[PDB]
Amino acid sequence: LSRREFSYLLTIKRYNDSGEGAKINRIAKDLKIAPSSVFEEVSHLEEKGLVKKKEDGVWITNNGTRSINYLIKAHRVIEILLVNIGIDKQTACEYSKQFDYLIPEEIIDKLYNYLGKPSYCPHGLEIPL
Amino acid sequence: NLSRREFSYLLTIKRYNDSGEGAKINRIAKDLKIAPSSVFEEVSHLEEKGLVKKKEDGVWITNNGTRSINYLIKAHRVIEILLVNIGIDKQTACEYSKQFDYLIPEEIIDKLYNYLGKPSYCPHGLEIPL
Amino acid sequence: SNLSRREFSYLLTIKRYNDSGEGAKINRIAKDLKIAPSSVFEEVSHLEEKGLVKKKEDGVWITNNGTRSINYLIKAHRVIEILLVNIGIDKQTACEYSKQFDYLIPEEIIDKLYNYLGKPSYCPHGLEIPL
Amino acid sequence: LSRREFSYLLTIKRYNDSGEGAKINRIAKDLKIAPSSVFEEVSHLEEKGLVKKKEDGVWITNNGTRSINYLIKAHRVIEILLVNIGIDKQTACEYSKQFDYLIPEEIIDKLYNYLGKPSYCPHGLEIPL
Ligand SMILES: [Zn+2]
Ligand SMILES: [Zn+2]
Ligand SMILES: [Zn+2]
Ligand SMILES: [Zn+2]
Ligand SMILES: [Zn+2]
Ligand SMILES: [Zn+2]
Ligand SMILES: [Zn+2]
Ligand SMILES: [Zn+2]
Ligand SMILES: [Zn+2]
Ligand SMILES: [Zn+2]
Ligand SMILES: [Zn+2]
Ligand SMILES: [Zn+2]
Ligand SMILES: [Zn+2]
Ligand SMILES: [Zn+2]
Numbered sequence: 001l002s003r004r005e006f007s008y009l010l011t012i013k014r015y016n017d018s019g020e021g022a023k024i025n026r027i028a029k030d031l032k033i034a035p036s037s038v039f040e041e042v043s044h045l046e047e048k049g050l051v052k053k054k055e056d057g058v059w060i061t062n063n064g065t066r067s068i069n070y071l072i073k074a075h076r077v078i079e080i081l082l083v084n085i086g087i088d089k090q091t092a093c094e095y096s097k098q099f100d101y102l103i104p105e106e107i108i109d110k111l112y113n114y115l116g117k118p119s120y121c122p123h124g125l126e127i128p129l
Numbered sequence: 130n131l132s133r134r135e136f137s138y139l140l141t142i143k144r145y146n147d148s149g150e151g152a153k154i155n156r157i158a159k160d161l162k163i164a165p166s167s168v169f170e171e172v173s174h175l176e177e178k179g180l181v182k183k184k185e186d187g188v189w190i191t192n193n194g195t196r197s198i199n200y201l202i203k204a205h206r207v208i209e210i211l212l213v214n215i216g217i218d219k220q221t222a223c224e225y226s227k228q229f230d231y232l233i234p235e236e237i238i239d240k241l242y243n244y245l246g247k248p249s250y251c252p253h254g255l256e257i258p259l
Numbered sequence: 260s261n262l263s264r265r266e267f268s269y270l271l272t273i274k275r276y277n278d279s280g281e282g283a284k285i286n287r288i289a290k291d292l293k294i295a296p297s298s299v300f301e302e303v304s305h306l307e308e309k310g311l312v313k314k315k316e317d318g319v320w321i322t323n324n325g326t327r328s329i330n331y332l333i334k335a336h337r338v339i340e341i342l343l344v345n346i347g348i349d350k351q352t353a354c355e356y357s358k359q360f361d362y363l364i365p366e367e368i369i370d371k372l373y374n375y376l377g378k379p380s381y382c383p384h385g386l387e388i389p390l
Numbered sequence: 391l392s393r394r395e396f397s398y399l400l401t402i403k404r405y406n407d408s409g410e411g412a413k414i415n416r417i418a419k420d421l422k423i424a425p426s427s428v429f430e431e432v433s434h435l436e437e438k439g440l441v442k443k444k445e446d447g448v449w450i451t452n453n454g455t456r457s458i459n460y461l462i463k464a465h466r467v468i469e470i471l472l473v474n475i476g477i478d479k480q481t482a483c484e485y486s487k488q489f490d491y492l493i494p495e496e497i498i499d500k501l502y503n504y505l506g507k508p509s510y511c512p513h514g515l516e517i518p519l
Contacts, residue, residue: 182427184394184431184434185392185395185434185438186430186434189427189430192424
C-alpha cells in the first residue's frame with residue numbers, strides 16, 4: 001500500500017461511511033487528479049482485493065479497511081517513537097509520513113508492543129489494534 | 130540524501146583512494162559488476178552532491194563523502210540496536226535495517242542514538258561512529 | 260543545458276514507450292540500453308530530481324520539461340553542426356565534434372546561434388531542428 | 391588541460407612571475423582547496439610535464455605557459471562568436487568558461503579564421519597567436 005493508495009482508500013471510505021459507493025469523478029475532484037488516473041488506480045486496487053465495484057460506484061473491502069487501519073497504526077506508532085526520542089509533535093507527523101508506509105510490518109507490531117500497546121498518538125487520535 | 134547504491138560507489142572509491150589511487154571508472158564498473166557508462170553518469174551526480182571529485186587520475190571521495198559513508202553506517206547500526214531491543218533476531222534486524230536506514234533523517238538517527246544510550250557497537254560487534 | 264548525453268539516451272528510451280501509451284518499466288529501459296536495472300533505478304531517481312521524469316506505478320513517464328530538454332539537446336547538436344559545416348568542417352567530423360560539447364552549451368547561445376544562422380530547419384544529415 | 395588545472399597554473403605562474411616557486415600550502419590558501427588535494431594534483435601536473443618541482447617550490451614550464459595561452463585563446467575566440475550572435479559580453483565571458491576548454495582544437499582554429507583572426511576579445515584583452 002502506497003501513501004497515494006492510502007488517500008484513495010480514505011476518500012472512498014468517506015463516501016461508503018456516508019452510504020454511497022465512491023464515483024470516479026468525485027474521487028478525482030476531491031483529490032485533484034485526472035479522472036483517467038483515478039480509473040486506472042481503482043482497477044489496481046480492485047486487482048489487489050482492496051475495493052470492489054458495484055452499480056453505484058466503488059466500495060472498500062474488509063481487506064481494504066484492514067490496510068487502512070494498518071497504515072494508520074504505522075503512522076501513529078512511529079510518531080510516538082519520534083516524540084519519545086525528542087522530536088517536536090508536528091515534525092514527528094511529517095517525518096513519519098515520509099517512511100511509515102515503508103517499514104516492515106514485524107517492526108510496526110514489535111514497536112507497538114515495545115511502546116506499551118498505546119491507545120492514542122501524540123495528537124490524541126486512536127491507534128488501531 | 131544518500132542511496133545504498135551510492136553507498137556502494139563511495140565505499141569502492143574509498144578503497145582505491147585509501148591506497149593513494151584515484152578510482153578509475155572502468156575498475157569501479159568491474160568491482161560493482163555494472164557498465165562503465167553507468168559509472169561515468171552516476172559519478173557526475175555524486176560530484177554535483179559534493180561527495181566526490183572527478184580528476185585526471187580518476188575519482189576521489191571528498192570529506193562530505195566520507196561523512197556520508199559514516200552517517201549511513203551509524204544509521205544502519207543504531208537501527209539494528211533498536212530492532213534487537215524490540216525482539217527481532219540480529220540477522221533479520223540487519224536485513225530489515227538495510228531496507229530503510231538510508232531513508233531516515235539525520236535528526237531522527239542522532240536522537241535515536243542518544244535515546245539508546247550512545248551505544249558503541251552494533252549487535253554484530255561492529256563500531257558505531259560518533 | 261544541464262542534461263547529459265547519457266541522460267538523453269534514457270529519455271529517448273522512456274519516450275518511445277510513452278509515445279506508445281505505456282510507462283517505461285525499469286527493466287525494459289535497462290535491456291534496451293544494455294545496462295543494469297539497479298543503475299537504471301538509480302539514474303531514474305536523479306532524473307526525477309531534475310523534474311525530467313515522473314516514476315509512477317505504470318513505470319516511468321517523461322515530463323513536459325523532459326520532452327523540452329530532449330528537443331533542446333537536438334537543437335543544440337544540429338545548430339552547432341550547421342555552424343561547423345559553414346566554417347569548413349566536414350559533416351561527419353562535425354557530427355562527432357558537436358557531440359563533445361553540444362550538451363554543455365546554455366539555452367541562450369543555442370537560440371541566438373539558431374537565429375544568427377537563419378533559423379535552419381534541418382541539419383546537414385537532413386534531420387529536423389526543433390524551434 | 392582542464393579548467394581546474396588551469397587555475398593551478400595561473401596561481402603557480404603568479405608566484406613564478408614575481409620570482410619564486412609556489413608553495414603547496416599557499417596554492418591551497420589561494421585556491422581554497424585542501425593541501426592534500428593540491429599536493430596530489432601538482433604531482434600529476436608534474437607527470438604531465440607542465441610543472442617542475444624543486445626545493446624552493448613548484449615552477450611553471452614553457453609547456454605550462456603554453457597551455458595557459460592556448461586556453462586563453464579559446465576563451466577569447468569563443469567570446470567574439472558569442473558577442474557576434476547577440477550575447478552580452480559579460481554573459482559571454484561567463485558562458486564561455488562553461489565549455490571553452492572542452493572544444494576540439496580544430497574548431498577554435500577554424501573559428502579564429504572565420505572571425506578574421508581577431509587580435510582582441512570584446513573586453514580588449516589581446517588574443518595569443
Ligand atoms: Zn496502485
Ligand atoms: Zn500524524
Ligand atoms: Zn500485524
Ligand atoms: Zn498523531
Ligand atoms: Zn546517485
Ligand atoms: Zn589534473
Ligand atoms: Zn594521482
Ligand atoms: Zn548490519
Ligand atoms: Zn550490525
Ligand atoms: Zn543523470
Ligand atoms: Zn549529428
Ligand atoms: Zn546532423
Ligand atoms: Zn572572458
Ligand atoms: Zn574577454
